A paper describes a structure:
Nucleotide-sugar transporters (NSTs) transport nucleotide-sugar conjugates into the Golgi lumen where they are then used in the synthesis of glycans. The CMP-sialic acid transporter (CST) is one of seven types of mammalian NSTs and is highly selective for transporting CMP-sialic acid (CMP-Sia) into the Golgi lumen as well as for transporting the free nucleotide byproduct of the glycosyltransferase reaction, CMP, back to the cytoplasm. Here, we describe the discovery that an endogenous methylated form of cytidine monophosphate (m5CMP) binds and inhibits CST.
In order to understand the molecular details of how m5CMP binds CST with a higher affinity than CMP, we determined the X-ray crystal structure of CST in complex with m5CMP. However, one key difference is that the CST-m5CMP crystals diffracted X-rays to a much higher resolution of 1.8 Å (compared to 2.6 Å for the CST-CMP crystals). This let us build a highly-detailed model which contained 13 lipid molecules and 162 waters resulting in a Rwork and Rfree of 18.5% and 19.8%, respectively. Overall, the CST-m5CMP structure is very similar to the CST-CMP structure, with a r.m.s.d. of 0.17 Å. m5CMP binds in an essentially identical orientation as CMP does and there are no obviously-significant differences in the conformation of the residues that line the substrate-binding cavity. This pocket is present but vacant in the CMP-bound structure which explains how CST can accommodate the addition of a methyl group at the C-5 position on the pyrimidine ring. By comparing the two structures, it seems that the burial of m5CMP’s C-5 methyl in this hydrophobic pocket is the primary contributor to the 16-fold increase in m5CMP’s binding affinity compared to CMP, on account of the hydrophobic effect. However, including increasing amounts of m5CMP during the 41°C incubation leads to more and more protein being protected from denaturation, to the point where saturating amounts of m5CMP are able to prevent any denaturation–as indicated by the peak height for the 100 μM sample being identical to the sample that was kept at 4°C. By plotting peak heights against ligand concentration, we can determine an apparent Kd of 1.0 ± 0.1 μM.
Author numbering: 9 to 317, 321 to 330
Write the structure that this text describes.
Amino acid sequence: SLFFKLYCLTVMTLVAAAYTVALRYTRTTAEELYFSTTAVCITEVIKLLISVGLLAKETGSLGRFKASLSENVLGSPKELAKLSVPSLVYAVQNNMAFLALSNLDAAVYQVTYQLKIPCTALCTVLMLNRTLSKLQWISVFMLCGGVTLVQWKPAQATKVVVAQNPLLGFGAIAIAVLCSGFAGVYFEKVLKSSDTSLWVRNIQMYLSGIVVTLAGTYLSDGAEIQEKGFFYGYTYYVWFVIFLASVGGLYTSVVVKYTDNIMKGFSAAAAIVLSTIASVLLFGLQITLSFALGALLVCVSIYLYGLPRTSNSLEVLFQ
Ligand SMILES: Cc1cn([C@@H]2O[C@H](COP(=O)(O)O)[C@@H](O)[C@H]2O)c(=O)nc1N
């Protein structure tokens, strides 16, 4: 149990960090530029395949595996229909991430996208029948400022050789921020509404996710893809991004299961701070004054959020 939590967070933290800069890299240095829509779609395919394997391991046998697929996919059309909503919303979110990093510096993206933290807290209280004390709300905005400081970097020195539309990038992030809170909390509500396996829920969602993301690939880029090919512009780094997005999505679902969507934001900030401090001590990595102050705010916000809060009996007695 202890090791699984350590492996989930160090995987989450290395993947999320590497993901943004690697994605930015692939969008700015290529001559032949791949279709972002296709990478989002292939990510859904990989997550489905890994989730299927994890369900086989969890069920423990081919017969129990087949039985679970039959009851929970073939036999649960309403669950498939419900989870099509976050699949639609996530298809937009993940495509907006590529659009934004095509047009903005990674650090500009990272700071702005942290607005998902208060968004996700609001979605949580509105959709999950939960409350936050006034002190907890303070801690949520404190966390947001802390991670903003943690992520604040000087702009990259490399000159960009492709056209950029930063305003389009900011519009993309604004959409992604709204998507992040709504789809994550929607998935959480479905997951915690029954004892159905996490891996069943992921399979249920990725099935519609593959359909929606491929349809979006067709509608956005179908004509140019018939000309250039679906995998036009793919490189080792494009696959690296897809792999990172796949692992990151799977571990996101795990963190939501064992904690919640608000704790996800606190735990990711703690992991970024601790892994950065580890790299200072192990490798002499240099940090900024912004990071140092943000780290303290992250620490205080975690402390404040966990402090002990009658006015929420419906919350604690039934979920
Ligand atoms: C909840 C959930 C999210 N995801 C993915 O995890 C990511 C969540 O990103 P954010 O924490 O920035 O919203 C998205 O890329 C989404 O597609 C997933 O793959 N499976 C899930 N069950």
